[PDB]
Amino acid sequence: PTTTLPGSGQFLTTDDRQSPSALPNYEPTPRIHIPGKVHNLLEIIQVDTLIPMNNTH
Amino acid sequence: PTTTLPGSGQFLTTDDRQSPSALPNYEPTPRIHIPGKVHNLLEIIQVDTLIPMNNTHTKDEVNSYLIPLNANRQNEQVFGTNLFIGDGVFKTTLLGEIVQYYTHWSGSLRFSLMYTGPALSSAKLILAYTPPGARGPQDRREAMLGTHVVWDIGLQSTIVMTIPWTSGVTSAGFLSCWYQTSLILPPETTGQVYLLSFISACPDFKLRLMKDTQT
Amino acid sequence: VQQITLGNSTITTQEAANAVVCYAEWPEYLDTSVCRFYTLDSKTWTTGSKGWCWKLPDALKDMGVFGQNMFFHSLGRSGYTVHVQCNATKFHSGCLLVVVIPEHQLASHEGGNVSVKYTFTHPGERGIDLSSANEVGGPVKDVIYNMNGTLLGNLLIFPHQFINLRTNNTATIVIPYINSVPIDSMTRHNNVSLMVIPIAPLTVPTGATPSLPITVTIAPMCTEFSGIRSKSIV
Amino acid sequence: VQQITLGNSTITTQEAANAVVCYAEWPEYLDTSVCRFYTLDSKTWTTGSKGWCWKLPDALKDMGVFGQNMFFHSLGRSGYTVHVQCNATKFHSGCLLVVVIPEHQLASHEGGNVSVKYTFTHPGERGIDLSSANEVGGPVKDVIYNMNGTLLGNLLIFPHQFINLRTNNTATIVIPYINSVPIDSMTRHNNVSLMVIPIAPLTVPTGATPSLPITVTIAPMCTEFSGIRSKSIV
Amino acid sequence: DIVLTQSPAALSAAAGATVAATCRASGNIHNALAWYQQKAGKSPQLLVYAAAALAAGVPSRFSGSGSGTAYALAINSLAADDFGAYYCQHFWSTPYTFGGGTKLEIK
Amino acid sequence: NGSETDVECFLGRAACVHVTEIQNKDATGIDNHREAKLFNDWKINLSSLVQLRKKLELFTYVRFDSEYTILATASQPDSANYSSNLVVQAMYVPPGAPNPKEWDDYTWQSASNPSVFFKVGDTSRFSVPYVGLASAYNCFYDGYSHDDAETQYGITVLNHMGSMAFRIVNEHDEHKTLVKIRVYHRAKHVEAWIPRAPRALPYTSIGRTNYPKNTEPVIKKRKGDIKSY
Amino acid sequence: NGSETDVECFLGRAACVHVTEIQNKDATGIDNHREAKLFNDWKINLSSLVQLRKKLELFTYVRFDSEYTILATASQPDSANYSSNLVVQAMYVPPGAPNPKEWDDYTWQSASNPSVFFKVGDTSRFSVPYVGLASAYNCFYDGYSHDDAETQYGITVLNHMGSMAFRIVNEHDEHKTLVKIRVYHRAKHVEAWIPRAPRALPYTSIGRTNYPKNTEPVIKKRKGDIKSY
């Protein structure tokens, strides 16, 4: 005994849900340690880059 | 209070789900112990099977499994093949029929030869492994300067050579055999003697991303 | 060792690791009744031989007390110890593949829905001469496709043993009872098929006869039959 | 310090924090074989120079035992220590950006699906002279877009170091092995690309020659190769 | 040595008849036989190798058969180009002796 | 590390074993209910699909529970005025049970034949256990079944997996609706014995190892000699 | 505090990667099954979308499981008499597997290609794992793939994410129905390495860093001099 709510069968694109895998039992290529892993975009804007202040061209 | 998600009422064919039984209360025929139960296809490609390296015929025959050897030939090549195990000599073997069900193999191979000529005959064959990326040798001496076994047919009637771990899917490696010495036949026993070559997989052989052969 | 006596039979043989127990399963109940060596007629491996195929228990259907109990009792259950011995000098070359194929369903030489007749699926002690001509209703005898549409090189997945005349001359394959039922009619259904196939052809020296005998000695072991015909009605 | 001896090579240099270890990851196995200083031909930084670009391991492909083992073995795995030294007086000004770009895929100067030829993606010890004319099949050499469509100011997200001739004259960048595979063919694929780009132009005093040498010294460190060609077949 | 006796010596047939040349050896060739075709003042060309396998550029009219010592070369539905001398050669034991030869003429 | 090579995973995947096509129309003056496609029965035969046959016949014996997913999709290639809302009876006939001869037989209402009633456009799903008579199915049978007479050498009723019969429960409209049914079998709890040689040659019969005559050589020829790499 | 700037959240959101359009009609006398739009295959290419390409190419390597949401909507711009109830096979072709050339090929019933059967108007949803051959995808490849010859410099088969093929399982009606399919990819479990410069110039090729010639300057000019605020 259940009742379907409003918003059933909708696809809200931003609503992250788990899904049935189209390749179960597939063992993907293993993760190696590549250096420079970025977890956060607030890590990489702290790197200073040049400013084009001489826009006069 | 529930909400149906996207992908409701779909049939993803690869999504294994339990189902209502069409014959509940049916007691099936009991399991007896049949020998030879296979849990894994990596169990049965480790069994070595013959290689048709003598592809030179326009028909299939037992002679295609026989690698011919010839007297009074020194520094020639006996056979030579690449080690693509999805094409060529390996396409019809038990390894290469089950490799070509999947997409990526990535393991070590177990390559054997078997000398079936007479017990008094003797020769030295040199069995070169050219790794992938390199060129296969084009004289006996380039074969000796690389990875090889100098296999005395007189002493050792069966040699077993483990091809190194490849991930091979020119490329995949080459494998040739050269006459170190000429074939010495027993007296008034002249003609050709034969080798039988075998391929299997070493137990570190993996196999992944199953695909479908068609016809 | 070299005077293996089983019943009132005795054979002389050689072994160091010669017995090939199929699928590492020794035959066992679910001897001392019909367990003796039955030594078939020796085949002549000439230079143009293609191979021989014996069906079991059909090769032992006229063999004394075993073949008597095979037709007396309906249901039976037997394992085998098959010795294939190809005696030769140290001048012969050539290689036999002695292979045991469970449920070797044969292919007819006419194709389609044409099936192989009972005369040919059950050939007896004679076996199937794979170098002979295809008869009407018989199996296909093309040895490259193993009489079933599967290539000869891939026949080593079955429990096999080579007779390389350079190295040895005997092959012993210890066959268990391989079936999907615990007991079955031995007269209508062949459990295994022994095949003896020359891969490398027989080469003789100059001055030798271009032929060589092959002796097949089948010893049925752990042979059971149904309890009926001696079960009491009271 | 100032007599850094690596193999039978020796260089004289200056450092206080000069080594830029890329992404704070020192190169390490998954020396003492091919680990020596290979000192490339000195480039002439004139007043109208636009920059230079060397591909690694392509810049070291003819360099002795390293370039021998690069073409002998298929697969390899190397990190680098790149010293870029621009010796000058205390009268020169100007600024170099010594940057190391992993997977610097170049842009062709014809656009569309036109790709850059192997002659130009693998230029060797010579490198790519970014101040020269675009040849047929070569990369685009417009330095403002870093030869890949991304602006020159944003090139500091890559592991870089400035050579401000006011302040210093050396740049050391310790490159690890950066790839998505654990080992790869060193002859078809360039891991990193060293670029030496004058941002502030070279100004000489009156009475000085309007040119200044730049020396690139690449020391391959933690260099591994595949176990094949010495793995036994037994 | 293995001596090939190629019987017959010459045949008269029309364009469409069946020609079965035959070679029989002293020793056992083990199917290592090659058949050749030669025209007048032309080089010999290879028709059948390994006693059953048709060579490159050979039509399906030719058919090698036989095993062991006796080997037949059956030619079915002759054409106008298929007249000439036919020679076996075994490739088993060094020397590689030829046969006698079968020539074809028109009735 | 090798979980794709398990026989639970190699043999256990949903393949298309049967595609039939039944029609919704009236039986007024219809003699044959199969030529009219009023219903279709299908003896469940996984060796009808030669891709799954060539994988099952890599083993001598195989024992699996079954899993049938049935997709029925409609089609109206005539004047229709509407797409009808149809219901399909997908009736599993067990081994040894009688098959339908008409679409309005007694067999369709037989309680011992399990049937699934589902809509066209939707999908059915049920599972049948191991309904063999031996302890495993026989991919190959060296002998005869039940008889001392000629019994076709390998044609045995031990491998009977049942039968699927399909009709449309709905009565006719004034237009003909064509329902195409796709049966998807997935072998589950698979276990297999005695690995065999892979079949090189194509098939000519079901339940027989007969290969066609004058076929092509499966071992392919080199572009050079044996020494050519 | 900065959970929107995570690469799990910056790169991990459902974008529209592909919009195709297939038709339901008969193949009677139809030569090309793509010009007729009886089916459409699509090599899965996230760099076809230049908004997601410009975000993925902010990093050198990226490794993510995939997540495809497929929305199929019908359309009948002719005389129709009814809206048909259609079923779409959305078949995922894995890397190294053959693509369909016809809508009634063997590939559609191939068991190793996973396919989703869903209704038009409804939505499909499935997930594909990391199907790359390296330990991450290559947004940029400085070199050649598999060969010592010319291999187009950055065109590599390591970045093959598979293929999606789409057909309508239903047979034809007497009217043509136009199904437009929208594939929505969401990169999940995203992890990224070696942050790169943002691309300033537009694109001319896929898998190539080539920018158009005689393009416009990206650094925009002041309305005054350098001293003007």
Side-chain angles (χ1 to χ4, degrees), chain B residues 86-116:
Chain B
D87 196 75
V89 300
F90 300 106
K91 187 171 170 65
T92 57
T93 63
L94 177 62
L95 181 64
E97 282 291 326
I98 296 173
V99 163
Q100 71 189 358
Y101 286 116
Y102 295 19
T103 308
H104 306 103
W105 49 273
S106 175
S108 296
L109 301 180
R110 181 185 292 112
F111 182 74
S112 298
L113 294 93
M114 185 181 178
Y115 179 69
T116 60

Side-chain angles (χ1 to χ4, degrees), chain B residues 19 31 40-41 87 102 209, chain F residues 4-5 67 127 135 191 220:
Chain B
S19 295
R31 292 176 176 90
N40 212 167
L41 286 181
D87 196 75
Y102 295 19
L209 206 156
Chain F
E4 307 192 11
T5 60
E67 171 74 25
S127 66
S135 294
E191 51 189 358
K220 63 184 180 182

Side-chain angles (χ1 to χ4, degrees), chain D residues 23 55 101-118 121-122 140 142 144-151 154-155 157-158 178-182 184 187-190 192-193, chain G residues 60-61 133-150 152-155 158 194-201 204-213 215-219:
Chain D
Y23 297 96
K55 301 290 185 181
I101 304 169
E103 302 295 325
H104 189 196
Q105 184 177 0
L106 300 174
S108 180
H109 67 88
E110 293 181 355
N113 290 321
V114 175
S115 180
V116 188
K117 294 180 183 291
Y118 181 79
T121 63
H122 289 78
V140 72
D142 199 0
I144 183 63
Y145 303 121
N146 295 328
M147 308 170 73
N148 58 7
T150 64
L151 282 174
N154 297 322
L155 200 60
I157 188 62
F158 297 109
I178 302 167
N179 201 354
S180 63
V181 296
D184 202 359
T187 60
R188 71 188 181 190
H189 170 260
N190 294 319
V192 296
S193 79
Chain G
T60 305
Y61 307 109
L133 293 178
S135 294
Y137 296 108
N138 292 320
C139 299
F140 295 91
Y141 192 74
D142 193 3
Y144 289 174
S145 177
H146 288 284
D147 286 328
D148 292 332
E150 295 291 330
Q152 292 91 22
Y153 186 63
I155 303 299
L158 298 175
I194 310 293
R196 298 179 71 89
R199 190 178 176 96
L201 297 177
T204 56
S205 179
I206 291 170
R208 293 182 177 95
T209 66
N210 299 323
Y211 59 87
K213 303 289 105 177
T215 183
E216 293 295 327
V218 57
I219 298 171

Side-chain angles (χ1 to χ4, degrees), chain B residues 11 19-20 22 28-31 34-41 53 55 60 80 87 102 137 209-210 214, chain F residues 4-7 51 63 67 114 125 127 130 132 135 186 191-194 218-222 226-229:
Chain B
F11 175 57
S19 295
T29 308
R31 292 176 176 90
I34 308 168
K37 181 188 277 288
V38 180
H39 297 89
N40 212 167
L41 286 181
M53 280 183 180
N55 289 326
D60 298 336
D87 196 75
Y102 295 19
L209 206 156
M210 180 173 173
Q214 182 57 247
Chain F
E4 307 192 11
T5 60
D6 288 335
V7 305
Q51 291 85 21
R63 183 189 174 99
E67 171 74 25
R125 193 181 181 93
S127 66
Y130 171 71
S135 294
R186 181 178 67 86
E191 51 189 358
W193 295 268
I194 310 293
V218 57
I219 298 171
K220 63 184 180 182
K221 187 174 180 179
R222 287 172 182 265
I226 189 171
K227 297 172 286 295
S228 295
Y229 298 100

Side-chain angles (χ1 to χ4, degrees), chain A residues 3-48:
Chain A
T3 61
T4 60
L5 287 177
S8 298
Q10 73 179 4
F11 175 57
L12 176 61
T13 66
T14 188
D15 185 67
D16 300 337
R17 300 290 185 183
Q18 294 179 356
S19 295
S21 184
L23 293 176
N25 298 315
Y26 175 72
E27 187 179 4
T29 308
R31 292 176 176 90
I32 67 168
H33 176 77
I34 308 168
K37 181 188 277 288
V38 180
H39 297 89
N40 212 167
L41 286 181
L42 297 173
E43 296 184 356
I44 71 169
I45 53 173
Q46 299 179 5
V47 177
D48 49 354

Side-chain angles (χ1 to χ4, degrees), chain D residues 55-176:
Chain D
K55 301 290 185 181
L56 289 170
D58 183 72
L60 302 175
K61 67 182 180 180
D62 298 336
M63 290 297 182
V65 183
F66 186 81
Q68 182 181 2
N69 291 319
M70 177 176 167
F71 288 101
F72 186 74
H73 300 89
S74 179
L75 299 177
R77 181 187 189 277
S78 179
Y80 300 99
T81 301
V82 176
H83 298 275
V84 175
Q85 303 180 1
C86 185
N87 50 1
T89 65
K90 294 178 173 63
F91 292 92
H92 293 89
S93 66
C95 188
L96 292 171
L97 178 59
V98 177
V99 66
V100 172
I101 304 169
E103 302 295 325
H104 189 196
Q105 184 177 0
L106 300 174
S108 180
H109 67 88
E110 293 181 355
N113 290 321
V114 175
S115 180
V116 188
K117 294 180 183 291
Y118 181 79
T119 306
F120 296 98
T121 63
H122 289 78
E125 183 185 1
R126 182 68 56 84
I128 299 168
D129 188 75
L130 272 66
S131 62
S132 66
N134 286 320
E135 296 184 357
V136 179
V140 72
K141 292 178 176 66
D142 199 0
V143 193
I144 183 63
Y145 303 121
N146 295 328
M147 308 170 73
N148 58 7
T150 64
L151 282 174
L152 178 63
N154 297 322
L155 200 60
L156 281 77
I157 188 62
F158 297 109
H160 71 285
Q161 189 171 2
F162 287 97
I163 298 172
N164 196 0
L165 297 176
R166 192 191 190 278
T167 300
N168 54 358
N169 52 4
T170 65
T172 300
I173 297 170
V174 181
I175 306 164

Side-chain angles (χ1 to χ4, degrees), chain C residues 102 105 108 113 115 188 190, chain F residues 135 142 144 152 196 205 207 210:
Chain C
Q105 184 177 0
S108 180
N113 290 321
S115 180
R188 71 188 181 190
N190 294 319
Chain F
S135 294
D142 193 3
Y144 289 174
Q152 292 91 22
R196 298 179 71 89
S205 179
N210 299 323

